[PDB]
């Protein structure tokens, strides 16, 4: 159904990797050779565009935008697209986002790869699903091989890449200083309103996952770098993909 | 629509301040000169009465009662009234409630002003809202100037006023001793089932916020003063308002 | 309505105790003298079978299975059955489940009775209920007299019985290592996706509650005994019931 349309649309392009673009990274859609832009509304069932082509000399699909849980209160907003990506032969999903840092040592404009997360005030996107596949193990949701490759790519470009735990809050209002003190007490390094439900759905669909946050601000109570933060992340990603033949 | 009705009803009274009355304080509606009582059912859209008149020689609207999240599972129950208050020219919202104390040093009958909160098992009232106004900063949700005035008024009446962080639980069942141990570990000073969603909505609508809890009990596992607690709070409020010309 | 059917079905059997059977314990339904099996679909309103008869020489109802919050997103799934049990004259509810251990000292195959719980990412089953009965005190949700009897029965059989706090996560995906570190930091000894909403509903309906988890695994990041774990629990339960005349 959705799979059918995209297959027609893709020239017979066969990407192994898809990238969900967070705020600040929307522009990456432009640096895509032989690009094929598909609006979300053309795609039946999809909840804002899908772009497929060559990036870093390798075939990719990008989602410019995503629907967040806070928008309609639907944590499974991204279920159908993620399923569709899986059915197109994508084996790897890279998720990017904007986040607040809970660490002095990790200022705005820093990039942090996710090694784990905490679902705090989100809802679980697999509620209402049937069959035993729903009991998804999440011990290594963030693929160890991909997390290493990203680290190696950052070192090759000589960009700092932090590592840490992302805590998901529903939003859309930001956190109070007390909620931020709690988040830290609970073990998070950064907070945000996205990504986690897509990681869960990805693991449900058998996709390997990497993720990274651009730090745009310190968390509330601790008191624009979002563009250079994003250019840093893009450079790590590009380098990561060129170095990977079978990635 | 709702604004229209209240404007007709209010004699051309123009309050800057509204007070949401928690359990125990319902009676304050009676000590209101030139009072104008409006039942909630007369007001179209409202989810229990609205009372406007002179209090402490100053124009006020009071909500005797509120709809809690636990009643129908609607965290935005109070959205329409709070919006309506804003549209009537109210610039300041004072929220009162009953809460459980997590501090030995803060017994039943104490009054605690809120300097911050933690939304624990509530839902965010702005889920499903559109436009960038929904990304409400909550760094100083509890107005610093109002929190000081309340403190000064308490000292002038020689009433103790505690200060602390309120944690919101959905309810309607109370917390277990283990949940109370957690609440403290997470940094709360008091717990309850109200207020926080109205603070969020208020900040969304540009209103300055003050809040205070009457402590009616210690939190579960730590083991009637609710009336004197309320009379203490009323005395602080009255004093706060008489001392403020432009409040 | 549901009460009517079960009364007809029960031969005029009058159980004081009901047992909700978790994964692994379904088989206990077989060791029930004079058994009367009733499928859930025969029972009007029920959300998988109800079995009543003699167990350990005493009259009992067992629920083989339960509907979890994660299945349809309905935390009050078990409301109607629990109410129905109360209306049949059941005064005591024993809940069993599978759980993950957060303690080295409590390995897979251990049995842990619940002395308290933490509702973490569950929803409260009493949201949407009317009347003052909904404000259920939960200071001693796990009956002290029943918890002692279970302990005494374990010692008589010479089985180890741990004691601790169960934290409820919605599921259906399992917890990340970071969520497990948090659960411990918040004071839990074991985690799972069940039981807590039924404890709340039970207390709402005036039933005394005992609960126990079979430990099937360590919690994520810390790295089959579920059958012997269950046989241990069954032995404690049997011994507990034979020793109780008025239990
Ligand atoms: O501090 C934050 N909190 C939540 N979401 C965010 N997205 C960017 N920064 C933040
Ligand atoms: O201890 C409490 N818990 C929750 N709500 C409350 N409202 C008054 N006291 C309490
Ligand atoms: O580790 C666990 N987590 C959640 N539910 C469970 N049920 C059995 N083990 C577990």
Contact C180, C221 (CB under 8 A): yes
* End-to-end Cα spacing for chain B: 28
Report CA-CA distances (Å) from B124 to A190, A198, B175: 20, 20, 20
Structure tokens at C211: 């609960």
Which residue has 């784990």 as its token pair? A116
Beta bridge partners of A97: A213
Residues of B in contact with A77 (CB under 8 A): none
As a whole number of angstroms, the distance between CA C74 and CA C97 comes to 19
As a whole number of angstroms, the distance between CA A237 and CA B156 comes to 62
Structure tokens at A23: 């705020």
Residues of B in contact with C137 (CB under 8 A): 173-174, 220
Nearest residue to A123 via CA among C173, C226, C176 = C173
Dihedral pair phi/psi, residue B243, rounded to 5°: -70, -20
Q: Which residues contact B29 (CB under 8 A, 6 or more apart)?
A: B21, B35, B37, B49, B51, B62, B64
Q: How far is the CA of A218 from the centre of ligand 1 (A)?
A: 8
Q: How far is the CA of A192 from the centre of ligand 1 (A)?
A: 5
Contact A61, A26 (CB under 8 A): no
Contact A75, A167 (CB under 8 A): no
Residues of A in contact with B187 (CB under 8 A): 178, 181-182, 185
Q: Do A138 and C178 touch (CB under 8 A)?
A: no
Question: Which one-letter DSSP state was computed for residue B106?
Answer: S
3-state SS assignment for residue C219: coil
Structure tokens at A106: 């990790």
> Cis (ω within 30 of 0) for the bond into A172?
yes
As a whole number of angstroms, the distance between CA C61 and CA C52 comes to 4
Contact B218, B225 (CB under 8 A): no
Dihedral pair phi/psi, residue A205, rounded to 5°: -90, 15
As a whole number of angstroms, the distance between CA C24 and CA C234 comes to 11
Handedness of CA B36, B39, B42, B47 (dihedral sign): positive
Report CA-CA distances (Å) from A59 to A4, A89, A206, A247, C193: 19, 11, 20, 11, 41
Residues of C in contact with A135 (CB under 8 A): 171-174
> Cis (ω within 30 of 0) for the bond into B88?
no
Contact B69, B170 (CB under 8 A): yes
Contact A190, A215 (CB under 8 A): yes
Contact C115, C126 (CB under 8 A): no
Nearest residue to A232 via CA among A152, A148, A157 = A157
Known binder of ligand: residue C234?
no
User: Distance of alpha carbon A38 from its chain centroid, rounded?
Assistant: 19
Contact B52, B60 (CB under 8 A): yes
Q: Residue C109: left if φ>0, alpha if ψ -120 to 50, beta else—which one? A: left
Which residue has 């390995």 as its token pair? C107
Q: How far is the CA of A133 from the centre of ligand 1 (A)?
A: 32
Report CA-CA distances (Å) from B22 to A25, B49, B86, B93: 46, 12, 20, 13
> Cis (ω within 30 of 0) for the bond into C50?
no
Known binder of ligand: residue B68?
yes
Known binder of ligand: residue C68?
yes
Q: Do B174 and C135 touch (CB under 8 A)?
A: yes
Contact B16, B146 (CB under 8 A): no
Contact C146, C203 (CB under 8 A): no
Q: Do C134 and B172 touch (CB under 8 A)?
A: yes
Structure tokens at C128: 């949407």
Contact C240, C247 (CB under 8 A): yes
Contact C176, C183 (CB under 8 A): no
Name the closest-CA residue to atom 8, ligand 1. A99
Nearest chain C CA: its distance from A190 CA (Å)? 13
As a whole number of angstroms, the distance between CA A37 and CA A9 comes to 9
Ligand 2 binding pocket mutation candidate from B112, B118, B216 (most atoms within 8 A of CB): B216
Which residue has 């989602």 as its token pair? A63
Nearest residue to A136 via CA among A201, A210, A208 = A201
Q: B135: domain CATH number? A: 3.40.50.1580
Q: Do B116 and A220 touch (CB under 8 A)?
A: no
As a whole number of angstroms, the distance between CA C51 and CA C93 comes to 14
Ligand 3: atom nearest CA of C218 is 1
Q: How many domains does chain C have?
A: 1
Scored b (16 or more CB within 10 A) or e, B140-172 reads: bbbbeebbebbeebbeeeebebbbbbbbbbbbb
As a whole number of angstroms, the distance between CA B160 and CA B149 comes to 14
Beta bridge partners of C111: C214
Chain B: which residues have CB within 8 Å of chain A?
A: 116-119, 123-124, 126-129, 134-139, 141, 165, 185-188, 200, 203-204
Structure tokens at A26: 């929307």
Contact C175, C183 (CB under 8 A): yes
Q: CA angle at residue C124 from C121 to C130, to 5 degrees?
A: 165
Q: Which residues contact A231 (CB under 8 A, 6 or more apart)?
A: none
Contact C70, C193 (CB under 8 A): yes
Ligand 2: atom nearest CA of B219 is 1
As a whole number of angstroms, the distance between CA B112 and CA A44 comes to 54
- Interface mutation target, options A73, A124, A195, chain C, most CBs of C under 10 Å: A124
Secondary-structure percent of chain A, ordered helix, strand, coil, rounded to 5: 35, 25, 40
DSSP for B39-55, please give it. EGGGSTT---EEEEEEE
Q: Do C135 and B171 touch (CB under 8 A)?
A: yes
Q: How far is the CA of A169 from the centre of ligand 2 (A)?
A: 24
Nearest residue to B211 via CA among B143, B138, B139, B158 = B143
Contact C197, C205 (CB under 8 A): no
As a whole number of angstroms, the distance between CA B150 and CA B156 comes to 10
Q: Which residues contact C99 (CB under 8 A, 6 or more apart)?
A: C112, C166, C190, C191, C192, C213, C214, C215, C216
Handedness of CA A152, A156, A157, A160 (dihedral sign): positive
DSSP for C128-190, please give it. T--SGGGS---TT-B-HHHHHHHHHHHHHHT---EEEEEEE---SSPPPHHHHHHHHHTT-SE
Resolution, Å (one decimal)? 2.4
3-state SS assignment for residue B209: strand
> What residues make up the domain containing B246?
1-247
Contacts 24+ apart (CB under 8 A), B128-132: B128/A71, B128/A72, B128/A73, B128/B76, B129/A172, B129/B204
Name the closest-CA residue to atom 1, ligand 1. A100
Chain A residue with minimal CA distance to C186? A186
Contact B111, B236 (CB under 8 A): yes
Contact C40, C113 (CB under 8 A): no
Burial of B228 (0-12, 13-18, 19+ CB in 10 A): middle
* End-to-end Cα spacing for chain A: 28
| Among the bound ligands, the one closest to the CA of A183 | 1
As a whole number of angstroms, the distance between CA A84 and CA A57 comes to 23
């Amino acid at each position: 159904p959705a799979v059918d349309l995209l297959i027609d649309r893709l020239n017979g392009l066969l990407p192994r990797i898809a990238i969900v673009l967070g705020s600040g990274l929307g522009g990456l859609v432009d640096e895509v050779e032989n690009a094929v832009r598909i609006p979300f509304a053309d795609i039946p069932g999809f909840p804002k565009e899908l772009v497929a082509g060559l990036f870093a000399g390798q075939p990719i699909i990008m989602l410019a935008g995503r629907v967040h849980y806070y928008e309609e209160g639907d944590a499974a907003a991204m279920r159908l697209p993620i399923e569709t990506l899986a059915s197109l032969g994508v084996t790897t999903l890279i998720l990017t986002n904007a986040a607040g840092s809970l660490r002095a040592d990790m200022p705005p404009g820093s990039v942090m790869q996710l090694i784990d997360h905490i679902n705090f005030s989100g809802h679980n996107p697999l509620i209402g699903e049937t069959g035993d596949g729903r009991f998804v193990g999440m011990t290594q949701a963030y693929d160890g091989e991909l997390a290493e490759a990203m680290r190696r790519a950052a070192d090759a470009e000589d960009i700092s890449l932090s590592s840490g735990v992302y805590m998901w809050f529903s939003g859309p209002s930001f956190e109070t200083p007390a909620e931020i003190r709690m988040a830290r007490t609970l073990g998070a390094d950064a907070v945000g309103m996205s990504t986690v439900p897509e990681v869960i759905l990805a693991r449900f669909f058998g996709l390997k996952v990497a993720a990274a946050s651009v730090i745009t601000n310190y968390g509330a109570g601790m008191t624009d770098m979002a563009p250079i933060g994003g250019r840093r992340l893009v450079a790590i990603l590009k380098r990561m993909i060129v170095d990977g033949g079978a990635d």
